[PDB]
Every structure is written in C-alpha cells, then in structure tokens.
Amino acid sequence: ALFSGDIANLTAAEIEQGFKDVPSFVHEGGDVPLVELLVSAGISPSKRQAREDIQNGAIYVNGERLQDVGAILTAEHRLEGRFTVIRRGKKKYYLIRYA
Numbered sequence: 001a002l003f004s005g006d007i008a009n010l011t012a013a014e015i016e017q018g019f020k021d022v023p024s025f026v027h028e029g030g031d032v033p034l035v036e037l038l039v040s041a042g043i044s045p046s047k048r049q050a051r052e053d054i055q056n057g058a059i060y061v062n063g064e065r066l067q068d069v070g071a072i073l074t075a076e077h078r079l080e081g082r083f084t085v086i087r088r089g090k091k092k093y094y095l096i097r098y099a
Contacts, residue, residue: 007062007079015083015095024083024095031073034061034086043086043094053088060087074098 003011010018025041032040035054039045044053057065062078062085075084075098084096 005080007082010062010085011079012082015085019085019093019095022092022094024097026097026099027074029098031077033069034059034066034072035069037074037096038086038088038094041086041094041096043088043091053090056088056090058089060089061085063087 007015023042025037027037027040035050038053038059039047039050043059044050053059055067057067059065059067061072066072066078072078072084075081075096078084082097085093086096087093
C-alpha cells in the first residue's frame with residue numbers, strides 16, 4: 001500500500017528492522033520521561049550521563065532531535081503509539097516499547 005503521517009518512514013516493522021542493530025526494551029505502559037526510559041532501556045543508566053544523553057541534540061527520538069521531558073515521554077508521545085527509536089548518536093539507535 002502506502003503510508004504518510006509522522007513515523008511513516010519508521011513504523012513498527014520499520015523500526016524493528018530499522019533498528020535491529022541494537023537491543024530493545026519494554027516498560028509497563030504509562031508515560032515515562034525520555035531520561036528514565038533510556039536509563040531503564042540501557043542507553044545511558046548513569047543518572048548524570050542519562051540526563052545529558054537526553055538533554056543533547058544528539059538524541060533524535062524517532063529521527064527528530066528531541067532533548068527535553070516537555071519534548072517526549074513515551075511511544076504514544078512520539079508516534080501514535082507502537083515503539084520509539086532513541087537515536088542517541090553518541091551510542092546507537094535503541095528501541096523502546098511498552099507492555
């Protein structure tokens with residue numbers, strides 16, 4: 001078929017195969033700040049590092065440099081709600097879902 005929208009270059013199967021370079025994580029649903037789901041997902045667990053690894057314009061969430069709690073919480077807070085790419089350029093493009 002065809003798609004367009006926000007994540008129409010990086011959808012569920014497209015994020016999976018897109019970002020099958022690194023491992024993924026899942027949390028229990030509920031919204032969750034970028035800087036706790038990266039810490040959880042093991043992008044940068046050291047709370048200082050985490051907070052810079054978020055506050056940098058080198059964490060492209062779903063391809064868009066988004067480096068604030070008022071920028072992203074969860075997958076449904078970035079796409080309509082499937083997964084999310086965390087393209088932390090200093091590390092890699094880790095993969096986030098919910099339960």
